[PDB]
Amino acid sequence: NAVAGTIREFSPKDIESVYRIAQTSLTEYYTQALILDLHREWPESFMVYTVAGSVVGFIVGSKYSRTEARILLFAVDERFRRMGVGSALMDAFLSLCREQNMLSVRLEVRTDNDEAIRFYKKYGFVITAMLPNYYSDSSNAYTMWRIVLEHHH
Numbered sequence: 001n002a003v004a005g006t007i008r009e010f011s012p013k014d015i016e017s018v019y020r021i022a023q024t025s026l027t028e029y030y031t032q033a034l035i036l037d038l039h040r041e042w043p044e045s046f047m048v049y050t051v052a053g054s055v056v057g058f059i060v061g062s063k064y065s066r067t068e069a070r071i072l073l074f075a076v077d078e079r080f081r082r083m084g085v086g087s088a089l090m091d092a093f094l095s096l097c098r099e100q101n102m103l104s105v106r107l108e109v110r111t112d113n114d115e116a117i118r119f120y121k122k123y124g125f126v127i128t129a130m131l132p133n134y135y136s137d138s139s140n141a142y143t144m145w146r147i148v149l150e151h152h153h
């Protein structure tokens with residue numbers, strides 16, 4: 001309870017913060033209005049990790065299919081990386097999927113991006129395809145995937 005910094009849900013009021021983290025963490029470009037737009041489609045999934053009322057990371061998703069969710073933007077501020085924030089947000093994203101009966105979740109990541117590729121592999125994600133000339137700068141992308149449902153013995 002005493003942990004400093006909790007997960008809340010994005011507000012149009014946080015845009016400059018998120019727009020700043022995305023500029024400085026993602027090679028693909030995202031205008032503020034586009035991010036504000038990605039909100040509208042699945043707002044409840046746009047969540048931020050807040051630390052002394054400063055957004056230090058955010059995730060945001062769409063419903064690709066009635067039951068498959070997709071992760072559109074995921075980023076955490078350099079100065080807070082490895083804090084374990086993005087694990088908060090993924091934990092939270094998955095919980096929300098569990099809640100709205102989304103049975104699996106996909107995403108697309110750059111191929112070169114080893115740092116994240118692991119992060120997701122830590123969370124159970126796996127590679128299913130490679131998307132040729134996917135990004136605007138003509139590099140490729142791995143599509144990663146996992147079921148939501150978990151069991152331990």
Ligand SMILES: CC(=O)SCCNC(=O)CCNC(=O)[C@H](O)C(C)(C)COP(=O)(O)OP(=O)(O)OC[C@H]1O[C@@H](n2cnc3c(N)ncnc32)[C@H](O)[C@@H]1OP(=O)(O)O
Nearest residue numbers: 025072073074075076081082083084085086087115116118
């Ligand atoms: C779909 C899209 O939008 S693409 C997403 C954009 N990709 C990015 O790189 C955005 C900027 N970077 C990130 O957001 C990083 O992936 C982060 C910040 C989420 C990872 O760090 P944080 O969220 O602050 O801490 P987090 O709890 O996520 O650490 C993740 C865990 O995965 C593993 N991990 C994280 N980074 C790495 C790495 N570079 N190499 C190997 N393993 C790693 C670690 O085991 C770590 O847990 P532990 O080190 O505490 O055991």
